[PDB]
PDB file of all heavy atoms in Angstrom:
ATOM      1  N   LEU A  45       0.823  -1.205   0.003  1.00  0.00           N
ATOM      2  CA  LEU A  45       0.000  -0.001   0.001  1.00  0.00           C
ATOM      3  C   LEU A  45       0.861   1.258   0.001  1.00  0.00           C
ATOM      4  O   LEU A  45       0.570   2.222  -0.722  1.00  0.00           O
ATOM      5  CB  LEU A  45      -0.934  -0.022   1.216  1.00  0.00           C
ATOM      6  CG  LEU A  45      -1.901   1.133   1.497  1.00  0.00           C
ATOM      7  CD1 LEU A  45      -3.085   0.628   2.308  1.00  0.00           C
ATOM      8  CD2 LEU A  45      -1.210   2.253   2.260  1.00  0.00           C
ATOM      9  N   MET A  46       1.932   1.263   0.797  1.00  0.00           N
ATOM     10  CA  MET A  46       2.793   2.442   0.885  1.00  0.00           C
ATOM     11  C   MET A  46       3.501   2.712  -0.438  1.00  0.00           C
ATOM     12  O   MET A  46       3.605   3.866  -0.868  1.00  0.00           O
ATOM     13  CB  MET A  46       3.819   2.260   2.006  1.00  0.00           C
ATOM     14  CG  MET A  46       3.239   2.162   3.411  1.00  0.00           C
ATOM     15  SD  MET A  46       4.399   1.400   4.573  1.00  0.00           S
ATOM     16  CE  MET A  46       4.677   2.717   5.739  1.00  0.00           C
ATOM     17  N   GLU A  47       3.995   1.660  -1.094  1.00  0.00           N
ATOM     18  CA  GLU A  47       4.677   1.845  -2.372  1.00  0.00           C
ATOM     19  C   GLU A  47       3.696   2.229  -3.476  1.00  0.00           C
ATOM     20  O   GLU A  47       4.030   3.044  -4.346  1.00  0.00           O
ATOM     21  CB  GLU A  47       5.435   0.572  -2.744  1.00  0.00           C
ATOM     22  CG  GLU A  47       6.653   0.317  -1.875  1.00  0.00           C
ATOM     23  CD  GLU A  47       7.270  -1.041  -2.121  1.00  0.00           C
ATOM     24  OE1 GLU A  47       6.603  -1.890  -2.756  1.00  0.00           O
ATOM     25  OE2 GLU A  47       8.421  -1.261  -1.690  1.00  0.00           O
ATOM     26  N   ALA A  48       2.488   1.662  -3.448  1.00  0.00           N
ATOM     27  CA  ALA A  48       1.501   1.992  -4.476  1.00  0.00           C
ATOM     28  C   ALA A  48       1.084   3.452  -4.387  1.00  0.00           C
ATOM     29  O   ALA A  48       0.874   4.103  -5.418  1.00  0.00           O
ATOM     30  CB  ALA A  48       0.285   1.072  -4.352  1.00  0.00           C
ATOM     31  N   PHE A  49       0.959   3.987  -3.169  1.00  0.00           N
ATOM     32  CA  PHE A  49       0.638   5.402  -3.026  1.00  0.00           C
ATOM     33  C   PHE A  49       1.761   6.274  -3.566  1.00  0.00           C
ATOM     34  O   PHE A  49       1.507   7.253  -4.274  1.00  0.00           O
ATOM     35  CB  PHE A  49       0.358   5.740  -1.561  1.00  0.00           C
ATOM     36  CG  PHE A  49       0.055   7.197  -1.329  1.00  0.00           C
ATOM     37  CD1 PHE A  49      -1.234   7.675  -1.461  1.00  0.00           C
ATOM     38  CD2 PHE A  49       1.067   8.087  -1.004  1.00  0.00           C
ATOM     39  CE1 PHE A  49      -1.518   9.012  -1.260  1.00  0.00           C
ATOM     40  CE2 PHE A  49       0.797   9.425  -0.805  1.00  0.00           C
ATOM     41  CZ  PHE A  49      -0.507   9.891  -0.929  1.00  0.00           C
ATOM     42  N   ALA A  50       3.010   5.916  -3.265  1.00  0.00           N
ATOM     43  CA  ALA A  50       4.136   6.727  -3.716  1.00  0.00           C
ATOM     44  C   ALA A  50       4.220   6.742  -5.235  1.00  0.00           C
ATOM     45  O   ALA A  50       4.454   7.795  -5.843  1.00  0.00           O
ATOM     46  CB  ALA A  50       5.437   6.209  -3.109  1.00  0.00           C
ATOM     47  N   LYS A  51       4.018   5.583  -5.865  1.00  0.00           N
ATOM     48  CA  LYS A  51       4.123   5.502  -7.322  1.00  0.00           C
ATOM     49  C   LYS A  51       3.033   6.321  -7.999  1.00  0.00           C
ATOM     50  O   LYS A  51       3.301   7.035  -8.975  1.00  0.00           O
ATOM     51  CB  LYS A  51       4.029   4.047  -7.761  1.00  0.00           C
ATOM     52  CG  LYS A  51       5.225   3.189  -7.394  1.00  0.00           C
ATOM     53  CD  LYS A  51       4.858   1.713  -7.478  1.00  0.00           C
ATOM     54  CE  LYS A  51       6.040   0.819  -7.142  1.00  0.00           C
ATOM     55  NZ  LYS A  51       5.596  -0.556  -6.785  1.00  0.00           N
ATOM     56  N   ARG A  52       1.802   6.249  -7.488  1.00  0.00           N
ATOM     57  CA  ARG A  52       0.693   6.949  -8.129  1.00  0.00           C
ATOM     58  C   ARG A  52       0.792   8.466  -7.979  1.00  0.00           C
ATOM     59  O   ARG A  52       0.397   9.202  -8.889  1.00  0.00           O
ATOM     60  CB  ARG A  52      -0.636   6.457  -7.547  1.00  0.00           C
ATOM     61  CG  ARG A  52      -1.870   7.000  -8.258  1.00  0.00           C
ATOM     62  CD  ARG A  52      -1.905   6.581  -9.730  1.00  0.00           C
ATOM     63  NE  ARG A  52      -3.045   7.158 -10.438  1.00  0.00           N
ATOM     64  CZ  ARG A  52      -3.354   6.904 -11.706  1.00  0.00           C
ATOM     65  NH1 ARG A  52      -2.611   6.070 -12.418  1.00  0.00           N
ATOM     66  NH2 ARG A  52      -4.413   7.482 -12.255  1.00  0.00           N
ATOM     67  N   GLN A  53       1.347   8.952  -6.874  1.00  0.00           N
ATOM     68  CA  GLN A  53       1.539  10.385  -6.676  1.00  0.00           C
ATOM     69  C   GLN A  53       2.873  10.899  -7.205  1.00  0.00           C
ATOM     70  O   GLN A  53       3.142  12.099  -7.097  1.00  0.00           O
ATOM     71  CB  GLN A  53       1.401  10.734  -5.190  1.00  0.00           C
ATOM     72  CG  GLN A  53      -0.004  10.508  -4.649  1.00  0.00           C
ATOM     73  CD  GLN A  53      -1.061  11.217  -5.479  1.00  0.00           C
ATOM     74  OE1 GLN A  53      -1.886  10.578  -6.135  1.00  0.00           O
ATOM     75  NE2 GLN A  53      -1.039  12.543  -5.457  1.00  0.00           N
ATOM     76  N   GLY A  54       3.708  10.037  -7.778  1.00  0.00           N
ATOM     77  CA  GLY A  54       4.992  10.494  -8.272  1.00  0.00           C
ATOM     78  C   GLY A  54       5.966  10.884  -7.182  1.00  0.00           C
ATOM     79  O   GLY A  54       6.825  11.746  -7.411  1.00  0.00           O
ATOM     80  N   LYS A  55       5.845  10.292  -5.997  1.00  0.00           N
ATOM     81  CA  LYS A  55       6.720  10.631  -4.878  1.00  0.00           C
ATOM     82  C   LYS A  55       7.441   9.387  -4.375  1.00  0.00           C
ATOM     83  O   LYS A  55       7.433   9.108  -3.172  1.00  0.00           O
ATOM     84  CB  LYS A  55       5.910  11.280  -3.750  1.00  0.00           C
ATOM     85  CG  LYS A  55       5.143  12.530  -4.163  1.00  0.00           C
ATOM     86  CD  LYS A  55       4.338  13.102  -3.002  1.00  0.00           C
ATOM     87  CE  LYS A  55       3.605  14.372  -3.408  1.00  0.00           C
ATOM     88  NZ  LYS A  55       2.855  14.989  -2.273  1.00  0.00           N
ATOM     89  N   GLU A  56       8.086   8.655  -5.278  1.00  0.00           N
ATOM     90  CA  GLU A  56       8.841   7.471  -4.872  1.00  0.00           C
ATOM     91  C   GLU A  56      10.206   7.835  -4.309  1.00  0.00           C
ATOM     92  O   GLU A  56      10.621   7.314  -3.273  1.00  0.00           O
ATOM     93  CB  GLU A  56       8.987   6.507  -6.055  1.00  0.00           C
ATOM     94  N   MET A  57      10.931   8.732  -4.986  1.00  0.00           N
ATOM     95  CA  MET A  57      12.254   9.147  -4.547  1.00  0.00           C
ATOM     96  C   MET A  57      12.215  10.193  -3.438  1.00  0.00           C
ATOM     97  O   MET A  57      13.273  10.608  -2.962  1.00  0.00           O
ATOM     98  CB  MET A  57      13.059   9.682  -5.731  1.00  0.00           C
ATOM     99  N   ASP A  58      11.025  10.627  -3.020  1.00  0.00           N
ATOM    100  CA  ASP A  58      10.893  11.666  -2.012  1.00  0.00           C
ATOM    101  C   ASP A  58      10.969  11.152  -0.578  1.00  0.00           C
ATOM    102  O   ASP A  58      10.870  11.960   0.345  1.00  0.00           O
ATOM    103  CB  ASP A  58       9.569  12.418  -2.207  1.00  0.00           C
ATOM    104  CG  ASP A  58       9.546  13.242  -3.480  1.00  0.00           C
ATOM    105  OD1 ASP A  58      10.586  13.844  -3.830  1.00  0.00           O
ATOM    106  OD2 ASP A  58       8.485  13.286  -4.141  1.00  0.00           O
ATOM    107  N   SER A  59      11.163   9.849  -0.369  1.00  0.00           N
ATOM    108  CA  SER A  59      11.286   9.274   0.970  1.00  0.00           C
ATOM    109  C   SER A  59      10.086   9.668   1.820  1.00  0.00           C
ATOM    110  O   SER A  59      10.185  10.546   2.684  1.00  0.00           O
ATOM    111  CB  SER A  59      12.596   9.716   1.644  1.00  0.00           C
ATOM    112  OG  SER A  59      12.615  11.110   1.907  1.00  0.00           O
ATOM    113  N   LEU A  60       8.956   9.006   1.605  1.00  0.00           N
ATOM    114  CA  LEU A  60       7.744   9.318   2.347  1.00  0.00           C
ATOM    115  C   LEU A  60       7.713   8.567   3.668  1.00  0.00           C
ATOM    116  O   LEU A  60       8.325   7.507   3.829  1.00  0.00           O
ATOM    117  CB  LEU A  60       6.502   8.974   1.521  1.00  0.00           C
ATOM    118  CG  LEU A  60       6.180   9.858   0.316  1.00  0.00           C
ATOM    119  CD1 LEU A  60       5.070   9.250  -0.514  1.00  0.00           C
ATOM    120  CD2 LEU A  60       5.806  11.271   0.744  1.00  0.00           C
ATOM    121  N   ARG A  61       6.985   9.137   4.624  1.00  0.00           N
ATOM    122  CA  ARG A  61       6.725   8.509   5.909  1.00  0.00           C
ATOM    123  C   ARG A  61       5.219   8.419   6.080  1.00  0.00           C
ATOM    124  O   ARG A  61       4.497   9.380   5.797  1.00  0.00           O
ATOM    125  CB  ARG A  61       7.361   9.307   7.052  1.00  0.00           C
ATOM    126  CG  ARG A  61       8.826   9.658   6.821  1.00  0.00           C
ATOM    127  CD  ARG A  61       9.705   8.416   6.770  1.00  0.00           C
ATOM    128  NE  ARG A  61      11.128   8.732   6.632  1.00  0.00           N
ATOM    129  CZ  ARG A  61      11.878   8.398   5.583  1.00  0.00           C
ATOM    130  NH1 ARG A  61      11.354   7.725   4.572  1.00  0.00           N
ATOM    131  NH2 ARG A  61      13.159   8.733   5.552  1.00  0.00           N
ATOM    132  N   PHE A  62       4.744   7.259   6.515  1.00  0.00           N
ATOM    133  CA  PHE A  62       3.310   7.015   6.656  1.00  0.00           C
ATOM    134  C   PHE A  62       2.987   6.889   8.138  1.00  0.00           C
ATOM    135  O   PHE A  62       3.591   6.069   8.839  1.00  0.00           O
ATOM    136  CB  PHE A  62       2.903   5.754   5.893  1.00  0.00           C
ATOM    137  CG  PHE A  62       3.179   5.827   4.415  1.00  0.00           C
ATOM    138  CD1 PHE A  62       4.458   5.605   3.925  1.00  0.00           C
ATOM    139  CD2 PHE A  62       2.166   6.128   3.524  1.00  0.00           C
ATOM    140  CE1 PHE A  62       4.715   5.674   2.568  1.00  0.00           C
ATOM    141  CE2 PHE A  62       2.423   6.195   2.163  1.00  0.00           C
ATOM    142  CZ  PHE A  62       3.696   5.968   1.688  1.00  0.00           C
ATOM    143  N   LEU A  63       2.050   7.706   8.602  1.00  0.00           N
ATOM    144  CA  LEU A  63       1.678   7.761  10.003  1.00  0.00           C
ATOM    145  C   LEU A  63       0.243   7.309  10.186  1.00  0.00           C
ATOM    146  O   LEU A  63      -0.641   7.655   9.395  1.00  0.00           O
ATOM    147  CB  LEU A  63       1.843   9.180  10.584  1.00  0.00           C
ATOM    148  CG  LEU A  63       3.237   9.723  10.934  1.00  0.00           C
ATOM    149  CD1 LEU A  63       4.175   9.763   9.739  1.00  0.00           C
ATOM    150  CD2 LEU A  63       3.105  11.107  11.564  1.00  0.00           C
ATOM    151  N   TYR A  64       0.021   6.524  11.235  1.00  0.00           N
ATOM    152  CA  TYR A  64      -1.310   6.129  11.668  1.00  0.00           C
ATOM    153  C   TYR A  64      -1.415   6.430  13.153  1.00  0.00           C
ATOM    154  O   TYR A  64      -0.585   5.963  13.941  1.00  0.00           O
ATOM    155  CB  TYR A  64      -1.583   4.645  11.392  1.00  0.00           C
ATOM    156  CG  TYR A  64      -2.883   4.138  11.978  1.00  0.00           C
ATOM    157  CD1 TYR A  64      -4.104   4.541  11.451  1.00  0.00           C
ATOM    158  CD2 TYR A  64      -2.887   3.260  13.048  1.00  0.00           C
ATOM    159  CE1 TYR A  64      -5.296   4.085  11.982  1.00  0.00           C
ATOM    160  CE2 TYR A  64      -4.074   2.792  13.586  1.00  0.00           C
ATOM    161  CZ  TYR A  64      -5.279   3.208  13.050  1.00  0.00           C
ATOM    162  OH  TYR A  64      -6.462   2.747  13.578  1.00  0.00           O
ATOM    163  N   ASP A  65      -2.422   7.220  13.530  1.00  0.00           N
ATOM    164  CA  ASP A  65      -2.590   7.680  14.907  1.00  0.00           C
ATOM    165  C   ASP A  65      -1.326   8.354  15.433  1.00  0.00           C
ATOM    166  O   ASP A  65      -1.029   8.317  16.626  1.00  0.00           O
ATOM    167  CB  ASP A  65      -3.004   6.526  15.827  1.00  0.00           C
ATOM    168  N   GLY A  66      -0.557   8.968  14.529  1.00  0.00           N
ATOM    169  CA  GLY A  66       0.635   9.704  14.906  1.00  0.00           C
ATOM    170  C   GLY A  66       1.909   8.890  14.999  1.00  0.00           C
ATOM    171  O   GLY A  66       2.964   9.461  15.302  1.00  0.00           O
ATOM    172  N   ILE A  67       1.853   7.586  14.739  1.00  0.00           N
ATOM    173  CA  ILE A  67       3.005   6.698  14.870  1.00  0.00           C
ATOM    174  C   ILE A  67       3.403   6.226  13.482  1.00  0.00           C
ATOM    175  O   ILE A  67       2.549   5.788  12.699  1.00  0.00           O
ATOM    176  CB  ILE A  67       2.683   5.502  15.788  1.00  0.00           C
ATOM    177  CG1 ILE A  67       2.284   5.988  17.181  1.00  0.00           C
ATOM    178  CG2 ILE A  67       3.868   4.553  15.866  1.00  0.00           C
ATOM    179  CD1 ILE A  67       3.328   6.846  17.868  1.00  0.00           C
ATOM    180  N   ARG A  68       4.702   6.303  13.176  1.00  0.00           N
ATOM    181  CA  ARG A  68       5.183   5.886  11.865  1.00  0.00           C
ATOM    182  C   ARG A  68       4.910   4.406  11.629  1.00  0.00           C
ATOM    183  O   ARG A  68       5.136   3.566  12.506  1.00  0.00           O
ATOM    184  CB  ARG A  68       6.677   6.171  11.712  1.00  0.00           C
ATOM    185  CG  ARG A  68       7.256   5.559  10.434  1.00  0.00           C
ATOM    186  CD  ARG A  68       8.568   6.180   9.998  1.00  0.00           C
ATOM    187  NE  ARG A  68       9.057   5.538   8.783  1.00  0.00           N
ATOM    188  CZ  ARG A  68      10.323   5.557   8.377  1.00  0.00           C
ATOM    189  NH1 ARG A  68      11.236   6.192   9.088  1.00  0.00           N
ATOM    190  NH2 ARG A  68      10.664   4.942   7.252  1.00  0.00           N
ATOM    191  N   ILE A  69       4.435   4.092  10.430  1.00  0.00           N
ATOM    192  CA  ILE A  69       4.156   2.715  10.043  1.00  0.00           C
ATOM    193  C   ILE A  69       5.428   2.062   9.530  1.00  0.00           C
ATOM    194  O   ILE A  69       6.178   2.652   8.742  1.00  0.00           O
ATOM    195  CB  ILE A  69       3.046   2.676   8.983  1.00  0.00           C
ATOM    196  CG1 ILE A  69       1.754   3.297   9.521  1.00  0.00           C
ATOM    197  CG2 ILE A  69       2.808   1.252   8.507  1.00  0.00           C
ATOM    198  CD1 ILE A  69       0.670   3.438   8.479  1.00  0.00           C
ATOM    199  N   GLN A  70       5.676   0.834   9.970  1.00  0.00           N
ATOM    200  CA  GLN A  70       6.733   0.022   9.400  1.00  0.00           C
ATOM    201  C   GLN A  70       6.161  -0.820   8.266  1.00  0.00           C
ATOM    202  O   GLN A  70       4.997  -1.229   8.297  1.00  0.00           O
ATOM    203  CB  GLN A  70       7.365  -0.887  10.461  1.00  0.00           C
ATOM    204  CG  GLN A  70       7.846  -0.155  11.702  1.00  0.00           C
ATOM    205  CD  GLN A  70       8.469  -1.088  12.725  1.00  0.00           C
ATOM    206  OE1 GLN A  70       8.800  -2.235  12.425  1.00  0.00           O
ATOM    207  NE2 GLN A  70       8.635  -0.600  13.953  1.00  0.00           N
ATOM    208  N   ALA A  71       6.990  -1.058   7.249  1.00  0.00           N
ATOM    209  CA  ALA A  71       6.522  -1.744   6.048  1.00  0.00           C
ATOM    210  C   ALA A  71       5.997  -3.139   6.364  1.00  0.00           C
ATOM    211  O   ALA A  71       5.034  -3.605   5.744  1.00  0.00           O
ATOM    212  CB  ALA A  71       7.640  -1.816   5.009  1.00  0.00           C
ATOM    213  N   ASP A  72       6.621  -3.826   7.319  1.00  0.00           N
ATOM    214  CA  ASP A  72       6.232  -5.191   7.651  1.00  0.00           C
ATOM    215  C   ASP A  72       5.030  -5.275   8.585  1.00  0.00           C
ATOM    216  O   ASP A  72       4.669  -6.381   8.995  1.00  0.00           O
ATOM    217  CB  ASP A  72       7.421  -5.944   8.264  1.00  0.00           C
ATOM    218  CG  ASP A  72       7.859  -5.363   9.591  1.00  0.00           C
ATOM    219  OD1 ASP A  72       7.659  -4.150   9.808  1.00  0.00           O
ATOM    220  OD2 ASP A  72       8.411  -6.124  10.414  1.00  0.00           O
ATOM    221  N   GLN A  73       4.405  -4.154   8.935  1.00  0.00           N
ATOM    222  CA  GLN A  73       3.243  -4.174   9.818  1.00  0.00           C
ATOM    223  C   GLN A  73       1.958  -4.276   9.013  1.00  0.00           C
ATOM    224  O   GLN A  73       1.812  -3.652   7.958  1.00  0.00           O
ATOM    225  CB  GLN A  73       3.209  -2.931  10.709  1.00  0.00           C
ATOM    226  CG  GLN A  73       4.444  -2.751  11.569  1.00  0.00           C
ATOM    227  CD  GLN A  73       4.361  -1.518  12.449  1.00  0.00           C
ATOM    228  OE1 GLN A  73       4.156  -0.407  11.961  1.00  0.00           O
ATOM    229  NE2 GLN A  73       4.512  -1.707  13.756  1.00  0.00           N
ATOM    230  N   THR A  74       1.015  -5.054   9.531  1.00  0.00           N
ATOM    231  CA  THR A  74      -0.286  -5.264   8.927  1.00  0.00           C
ATOM    232  C   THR A  74      -1.332  -4.400   9.617  1.00  0.00           C
ATOM    233  O   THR A  74      -1.148  -3.980  10.761  1.00  0.00           O
ATOM    234  CB  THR A  74      -0.694  -6.736   9.048  1.00  0.00           C
ATOM    235  OG1 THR A  74      -0.997  -7.036  10.416  1.00  0.00           O
ATOM    236  CG2 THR A  74       0.439  -7.641   8.582  1.00  0.00           C
ATOM    237  N   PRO A  75      -2.449  -4.101   8.942  1.00  0.00           N
ATOM    238  CA  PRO A  75      -3.541  -3.403   9.641  1.00  0.00           C
ATOM    239  C   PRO A  75      -3.998  -4.138  10.885  1.00  0.00           C
ATOM    240  O   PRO A  75      -4.431  -3.497  11.853  1.00  0.00           O
ATOM    241  CB  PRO A  75      -4.654  -3.320   8.581  1.00  0.00           C
ATOM    242  CG  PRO A  75      -4.239  -4.259   7.488  1.00  0.00           C
ATOM    243  CD  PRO A  75      -2.749  -4.320   7.518  1.00  0.00           C
ATOM    244  N   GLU A  76      -3.895  -5.469  10.892  1.00  0.00           N
ATOM    245  CA  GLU A  76      -4.188  -6.238  12.098  1.00  0.00           C
ATOM    246  C   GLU A  76      -3.201  -5.914  13.211  1.00  0.00           C
ATOM    247  O   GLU A  76      -3.591  -5.774  14.378  1.00  0.00           O
ATOM    248  CB  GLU A  76      -4.153  -7.729  11.771  1.00  0.00           C
ATOM    249  CG  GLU A  76      -4.633  -8.637  12.881  1.00  0.00           C
ATOM    250  CD  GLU A  76      -4.725 -10.077  12.435  1.00  0.00           C
ATOM    251  OE1 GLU A  76      -5.595 -10.391  11.595  1.00  0.00           O
ATOM    252  OE2 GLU A  76      -3.910 -10.899  12.914  1.00  0.00           O
ATOM    253  N   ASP A  77      -1.912  -5.799  12.878  1.00  0.00           N
ATOM    254  CA  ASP A  77      -0.908  -5.421  13.866  1.00  0.00           C
ATOM    255  C   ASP A  77      -1.243  -4.077  14.506  1.00  0.00           C
ATOM    256  O   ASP A  77      -1.053  -3.886  15.709  1.00  0.00           O
ATOM    257  CB  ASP A  77       0.475  -5.359  13.221  1.00  0.00           C
ATOM    258  CG  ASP A  77       0.989  -6.722  12.809  1.00  0.00           C
ATOM    259  OD1 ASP A  77       0.614  -7.721  13.455  1.00  0.00           O
ATOM    260  OD2 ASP A  77       1.771  -6.787  11.840  1.00  0.00           O
ATOM    261  N   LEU A  78      -1.725  -3.131  13.704  1.00  0.00           N
ATOM    262  CA  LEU A  78      -2.012  -1.782  14.167  1.00  0.00           C
ATOM    263  C   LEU A  78      -3.456  -1.601  14.618  1.00  0.00           C
ATOM    264  O   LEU A  78      -3.863  -0.466  14.896  1.00  0.00           O
ATOM    265  CB  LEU A  78      -1.682  -0.776  13.059  1.00  0.00           C
ATOM    266  CG  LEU A  78      -0.251  -0.863  12.516  1.00  0.00           C
ATOM    267  CD1 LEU A  78      -0.017   0.145  11.396  1.00  0.00           C
ATOM    268  CD2 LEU A  78       0.753  -0.652  13.636  1.00  0.00           C
ATOM    269  N   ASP A  79      -4.229  -2.688  14.707  1.00  0.00           N
ATOM    270  CA  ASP A  79      -5.627  -2.640  15.125  1.00  0.00           C
ATOM    271  C   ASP A  79      -6.423  -1.613  14.325  1.00  0.00           C
ATOM    272  O   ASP A  79      -7.235  -0.857  14.862  1.00  0.00           O
ATOM    273  CB  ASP A  79      -5.738  -2.370  16.629  1.00  0.00           C
ATOM    274  CG  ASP A  79      -5.183  -3.504  17.469  1.00  0.00           C
ATOM    275  OD1 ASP A  79      -5.536  -4.673  17.197  1.00  0.00           O
ATOM    276  OD2 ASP A  79      -4.385  -3.234  18.393  1.00  0.00           O
ATOM    277  N   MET A  80      -6.179  -1.587  13.017  1.00  0.00           N
ATOM    278  CA  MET A  80      -6.890  -0.672  12.140  1.00  0.00           C
ATOM    279  C   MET A  80      -8.322  -1.146  11.900  1.00  0.00           C
ATOM    280  O   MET A  80      -8.611  -2.346  11.874  1.00  0.00           O
ATOM    281  CB  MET A  80      -6.164  -0.540  10.804  1.00  0.00           C
ATOM    282  CG  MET A  80      -4.847   0.210  10.871  1.00  0.00           C
ATOM    283  SD  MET A  80      -4.038   0.239   9.262  1.00  0.00           S
ATOM    284  CE  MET A  80      -2.858   1.567   9.497  1.00  0.00           C
TER     285      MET A  80
END
């Protein structure tokens, strides 16, 4: 999901950070891990 968003917005080389409830998401975390 994180890579697909970056590719569609043209921000792959921009080093994006994804936050949920204010905490940075790790790539290996699932929505189940984060109780989404």
